């Protein structure tokens, strides 16, 4: 259910080589909050990969601490998938967390590396979140 304390979800970005603005994945509910993958080009140059939590809510009282593994799937060999871990207290003023320079853009879009296929790149997030505060009283 949506009250699950953890989950793994993915978001495949299409026409990746042409990405110019930030893209957001549909929500994946964990601890009954909407979590989303955020991808954006940073400085061509590098891939911005962030995890966002409850960004739409106009509430300023919520907070949820979570740890997560951010991974860019390598379709040819999952052991080659690249991932970084994060730990962060999400709240309205810091509703997303990740790396502006998660991977070199030239590496991810290199057709010989196994991360891109038909100009599509798959991102994955494994998030483990504690019970939230200031949401369900």
């Amino acid at each position: 259910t949506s009250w699950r304390s953890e989950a793994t979800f993915q978001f495949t970005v299409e026409r990746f080589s042409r990405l110019s603005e930030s893209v957001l994945s549909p929500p994946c509910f964990v601890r009954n909050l909407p979590w989303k993958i955020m991808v954006m080009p940073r400085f061509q140059k590098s891939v911005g990969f962030f995890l966002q939590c409850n960004a739409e809510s106009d509430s300023t009282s919520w907070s949820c601490h979570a740890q997560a593994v951010l991974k860019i799937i390598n379709y040819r060999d999952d052991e080659k998938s690249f991932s970084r871990r994060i730990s962060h207290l999400f709240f309205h003023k810091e509703n997303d967390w990740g790396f502006s320079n998660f991977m070199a853009w030239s590496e991810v879009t290199d057709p010989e590396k196994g991360f891109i296929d038909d100009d599509k790149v798959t991102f994955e997030v494994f998030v483990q979140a504690d019970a939230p505060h200031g949401v369900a009283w």
């Binding site: 930030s22 955020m38 954006m40 911005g48 962030f50 970084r84 962060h88 990740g98 502006s100």
Partner: peptide, 6 residues
């Protein structure tokens, strides 16, 4: 190190 997107 990690951080926010903005």
């Amino acid at each position: 190190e990690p951080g926010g997107s903005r």
